[PDB]
Ligand binder design. Structure first.
Ligand SMILES: CN1[C@@H]2CC[C@H]1C[C@H](OC(=O)[C@H](CO)c1ccccc1)C2
Length: 121
């Protein structure tokens, strides 16, 4: 679920999902179009594609379970949708962590008109 993803993001990065990642660049928090602005935005692009691989799943609301094995995220078995959603979220949280070194506040609340063009998954 979105709330679980937000908790995972905070655990991983030390940043609150809202507002650090809810309106960032062209793909974080609201998706759509444009060339991703930087590595963090590319994490969101891929996360959006990942959810897009699951047409008949409901990532915003469906809850999954996971544990930590030392720092590693381990998705625990639930329904097939839950397992796949968890793997999408885990990857995005790791990606955000890997790209904190280039996170830029200038991309928070990024305006929609600066995001044009389709980028295929
Ligand atoms: C799980 N749902 C999909 C359709 C709305 C959502 C979120 C999707 O893509 C996103 O993760 C983005 C954030 O990057 C998002 C946009 C708008 C609302 C919630 C999430 C796929």
């Amino acid at each position: 679920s979105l709330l679980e993803f937000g908790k995972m993001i905070l655990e991983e990065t030390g940043k609150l999902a809202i507002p650090s990642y809810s309106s960032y660049g062209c793909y974080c928090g609201w998706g759509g179009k444009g060339t991703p602005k930087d590595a963090t935005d590319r994490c969101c692009f891929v996360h959006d594609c990942c959810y897009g691989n699951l047409p008949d799943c409901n990532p915003k609301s469906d809850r999954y379970k996971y544990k930590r094995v030392n720092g590693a995220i381990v998705c625990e078995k639930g329904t097939s949708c839950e397992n796949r959603i968890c793997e999408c979220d885990k990857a995005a949280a790791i990606c955000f962590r890997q790209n904190l070194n280039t996170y830029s506040k200038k991309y928070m609340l990024y305006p929609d008109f600066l995001c044009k063009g389709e980028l295929k998954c």
